[PDB]
Design a protein around this ligand. Structure first.
Ligand SMILES: Nc1nc2c(ncn2[C@@H]2O[C@H](COP(=O)(O)OP(=O)(O)OP(=O)(O)O)[C@@H](O)[C@H]2O)c(=O)[nH]1
Ligand SMILES: CN[C@@H]1CCc2c(ccc(O)c2O)[C@H]1O
Lengths: 50, 335, 282, 237
């Protein structure tokens, strides 16, 4: 009873192509890769733990 | 009847999902330059816990953090100078989770006593004392996260979650639908949705304002132990105990990549992302943590400084350090 | 003599190689730092000092058949010999008593042997060892009275050993005989406890399923120490009670047989799986 | 400046001063986990010992601190909280031995045996020993003395079982009740002995509600457990 109603709501949902989602995630990663202190080691002058 | 009609929609959903799979994330990202080799060295080591550690949460200022141990203590540290600030004694020695409020005024805790407790840190004319005890669950607490200074979301082993009101101690709403113990949860960057992974190998996407489930993902094969959003807010990752991780997409409503290796046969205790969402750090039962690549599924470093099972793992808001905890009662800050 | 010099180079290396690893592994790894390992590192340090500054000069004196370092260095070398031998035997008694306390009374072991009292015990052991060797030797409270003794004392090239009847007995009793009875009693009690526990296990579930496991370990531990150090401490009193009975070559040979226990110790007291993993890591 | 750093070390020193004092109590106390099944009698046993969410009791015998835990309020067929109790001294298992003819379907003894097998063969509890109390002996004796029920119908293997030669029957006891008592103990010991190799053992006791020797039994079993641990560590056993 409850399940039939529940999957009825989950059936009618718009979905986008996988290529678009992959492109968006890779674009976000490429754009924000500059300010990632763990990807590229920072100068030792601004490393509070060293 | 109803049972037959149930399976009719379960096959319609799979048809809709398969129609949108133009290509795979591996195929698209073939030309991305590999990240290379990433090596991290321990910078600080924190000592003082008398027993194994289950929980840890970073502060919003990226300087203080809280830890929970089975000896019945809640110690607040100072990572920059390695100085203990507080040590709250607990009524029950079986603690399984902890959290740190965004404003820093309060700290939450819970465990096998089925109760969530909030401690008022920044009090006037006195020490830290318990402020409110929240009761009503019928199973051990698994996680709890703060939305703001007056609300908190908790999940327990009675296959349900709940949204509390600290001022009055009442359940504003409850979320039902899982058929097994709920093991973790994580709030969205804008705190409008959250996801929870249970022991029936399924993760759901709840809505805080309404109180209803929206999507369900069933890619795993066994228990789910960890979960975390991508920094974007349009994806998340899971970690199961069959030595596999997966990346799910909300908009595409299906799995994108799997992070597995042939030489790993141990379970996963925790996962976490990086500041830019490019690296994925995971914990393991085999005493060390591995660093993956989000867009390539290629391992790019191992952190092997612990002498026992790793139980918790967290990354600071500014993306400058990684904190890990283990069952040997030691924390380590990597950089 | 040509062959003798070659083999003695292995003994110097064996003592130093096998004892440096024990000290480094305990210090490098935090999980090996327990209360019981403090006594082991004390024993290792004593054996290291012996292998570094006792065997080399003695071997050189044996090869060259003369002492070419004056008299102050000869007396200092003798003091180091006695201090390092005495401080090495007394730690085995400490380890035996520690095991006796751990097994016989298991509830009170945690409170009795605290990390603070181990330091006091080690300091007392090293102080008692130092008072036996440096104080009497450096202040000439042990010299003999016959013509040969004073003749060799006068020479700057003769560095030999002569003592009176009281000091030989006192040194032997303080160094060897007293720890032996304690260790024998302790290990007898431990063996009885192990046998009783095994008998209870056998009686509990005999149908669904002796003492050789304990016997082999106790035999190794007792036999190595006794075979190494007993003949020397018999002749050390025999050659004083009735002179013109013991030759010099016998004395030197028995003393050198006694020395090698310092190199044999880590093969006995450091065979735990954690130690094996630590050694394999290096 | 340095004015604030001075006070940081003062509060740090007070914290580590107290952590040293609280470590002495933690290392000198023994923790026990109390398990069982439905209607076995866990509460009845724990109530008598105390006179002499979660439920915890603190009692002291021979100047030794003991601490007991009874897990209640969590009723799950699968146990994921069992990983927490991997550093306890011993586990206390309570079973009603006078429930062989009761249907939970399978009997209740079969359910207890399955639970014991699952607990014994577990990844985290590969070192913890078990103290086993076979409760409700008077009811078992009455059932056996009466001819109403026979163990053969529910346990066919009982037909070919014979009383062990080495036994210590209580004074004024009957061969039938003694044989029935020993059959179930042997049934538990058979599962116990197959898996472990010296790392952990099982201690079976015959227990009723009236007797008050249970605290001494727990004391002696814990003493033996620690002695065997030390002997195995020193390679003497
Ligand atoms: N006559 C008799 N009854 C007993 C004895 N031991 C236990 N019982 C019964 O056990 C009952 C209470 O124990 P349980 O029914 O197991 O309930 P509990 O003690 O909370 O244990 P759990 O059901 O496991 O939670 C009593 O009312 C008794 O009837 C016994 O030795 N003799
Ligand atoms: C020449 N070497 C010495 C001679 C006497 C002596 C030794 C060791 C311990 C003692 O108590 C002693 O009296 C030997 O190592």
């Amino acid at each position: 009873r409850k399940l039939v109603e529940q999957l009825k709501m989950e059936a009618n949902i718009d979905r986008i192509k996988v290529s678009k989602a992959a492109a968006d995630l890779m674009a976000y990663c490429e754009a924000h890769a500059k300010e990632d202190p763990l990807l590229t080691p920072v100068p030792a002058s601004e490393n509070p733990f060293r | 009847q109803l049972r037959q009609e149930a399976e009719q929609l379960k096959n319609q959903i799979r048809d809709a999902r398969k129609a949108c799979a133009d290509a795979t994330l591996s195929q698209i990202t073939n030309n991305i330059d590999p990240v290379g080799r990433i090596q991290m060295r321990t910078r600080r080591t924190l000592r003082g816990h008398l027993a194994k550690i289950y929980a840890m949460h970073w502060g919003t200022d990226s300087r203080l953090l809280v830890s929970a141990s089975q000896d019945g203590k809640l110690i607040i540290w100072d990572s920059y100078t390695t100085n203990k600030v507080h040590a709250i004694p607990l009524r029950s020695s079986w603690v399984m989770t902890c959290a740190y409020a965004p404003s820093g005024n309060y700290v939450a805790c819970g465990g096998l006593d089925n109760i969530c407790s909030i401690y008022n840190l920044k009090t006037r004319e006195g020490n830290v004392r318990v402020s409110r005890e929240l009761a009503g669950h019928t199973g051990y607490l698994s996680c709890c996260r703060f939305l703001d200074d007056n609300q908190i979301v908790t999940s327990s082993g009675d296959t349900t979650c709940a949204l509390w009101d600290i001022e009055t101690g009442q359940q504003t709403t409850t979320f039902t639908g899982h058929t097994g113990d709920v093991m973790s949860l994580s709030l969205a960057p804008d705190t409008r949705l959250f996801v929870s992974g249970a022991c029936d190998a399924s993760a759901k996407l709840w809505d805080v304002r309404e109180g209803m489930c929206r999507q369900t993902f069933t890619g795993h094969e066994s228990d789910i132990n960890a979960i975390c959003f991508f920094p974007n807010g349009n994806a998340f990752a899971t970690g199961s105990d069959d030595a596999t991780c997966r990346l799910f997409d909300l908009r595409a409503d299906q799995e994108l990549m799997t992070y597995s290796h042939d030489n790993i046969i141990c379970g996963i205790t925790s996962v976490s992302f990086s500041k830019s969402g490019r690296l994925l750090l995971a914990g393991y039962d085999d005493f060390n943590c591995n660093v993956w690549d989000a867009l390539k599924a290629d391992r790019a470093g191992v952190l092997a400084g612990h002498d026992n099972r790793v139980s918790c793992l967290g990354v600071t808001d500014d993306g400058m350090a990684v904190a890990t905890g283990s069952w040997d009662s030691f924390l380590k800050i990597w950089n | 003599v040509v062959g003798m010099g070659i083999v003695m180079s292995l003994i110097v290396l064996a003592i130093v190689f096998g004892n440096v690893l024990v000290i480094t592994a305990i210090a490098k790894f935090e999980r090996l730092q327990t209360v019981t390992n403090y006594f082991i590192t004390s024993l290792a340090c004593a054996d290291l000092v012996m292998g570094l500054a006792v065997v080399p000069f003695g071997a050189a004196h044996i090869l060259t058949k003369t002492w070419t370092f004056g008299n102050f260095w000869c007396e200092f070398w003798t003091s180091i010999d006695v201090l390092c031998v005495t401080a090495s035997i007394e730690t085995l008694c400490v380890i035996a008593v520690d095991r006796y306390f751990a097994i016989t009374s298991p509830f009170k072991y945690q409170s009795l042997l605290t990390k603070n009292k181990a330091r006091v015990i080690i300091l007392m052991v090293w102080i008692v060892s130092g008072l036996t060797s440096f104080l009497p030797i450096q202040m000439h409270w042990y010299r003999a009275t016959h013509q040969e003794a004073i003749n060799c004392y006068a020479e700057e090239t003769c560095c030999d050993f002569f003592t009176n009847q009281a000091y030989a007995i006192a040194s032997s009793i303080v160094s060897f005989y007293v720890p032996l009875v304690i260790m024998v009693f302790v290990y007898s009690r431990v063996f009885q406890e192990a046998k009783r526990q095994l008998q209870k296990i056998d009686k509990s579930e005999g149908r669904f399923h002796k003492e050789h496991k304990a016997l082999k370990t106790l035999g190794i531990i007792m036999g190595t120490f006794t075979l190494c150090w007993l003949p020397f401490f018999i002749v050390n009193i025999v050659h004083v009670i009735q002179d013109n009975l013991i030759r010099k070559e016998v004395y030197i040979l028995l003393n050198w047989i006694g020395y090698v226990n310092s190199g044999f110790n880590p093969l006995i007291y450091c065979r735990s799986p954690d130690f094996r993993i630590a050694f394999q890591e290096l | 400046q340095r004015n604030e750093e001075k006070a940081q070390r003062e509060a740090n020193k007070k914290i580590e001063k107290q952590l040293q004092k609280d470590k002495q109590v933690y290392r000198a106390t023994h923790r026990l986990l109390l398990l069982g099944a439905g209607e076995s009698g866990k509460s009845t046993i724990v109530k008598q010992m105390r006179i002499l969410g979660i439920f915890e009791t603190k009692f002291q015998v021979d100047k030794v601190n003991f601490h007991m835990f009874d897990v209640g309020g969590q009723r799950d067929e699968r146990r994921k909280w069992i990983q927490c109790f991997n550093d306890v001294t011993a586990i206390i298992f309570v079973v009603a031995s006078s429930s062989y003819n009761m249907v939970i379907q399978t009997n209740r003894l079969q359910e207890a045996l399955n639970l014991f097998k699952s607990i014994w063969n577990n990844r985290w509890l590969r070192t913890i020993s078990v103290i086993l109390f076979l409760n409700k002996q008077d009811l078992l004796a009455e059932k056996v003395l009466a001819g109403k029920s026979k163990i053969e119908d529910y346990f066919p293997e009982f037909a070919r079982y014979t009383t062990p030669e080495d036994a210590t029957p209580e004074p004024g006891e009957d061969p039938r009740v003694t044989r029935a008592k020993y059959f179930i103990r042997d049934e538990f010991l058979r599962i116990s002995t197959a898996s472990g190799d010296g790392r952990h053992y099982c201690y079976p006791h015959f227990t009723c509600a009236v007797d008050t020797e249970n605290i001494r039994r727990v004391f002696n079993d814990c003493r033996d457990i620690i002695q065997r641990m030390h002997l195995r560590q020193y390679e003497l056993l």
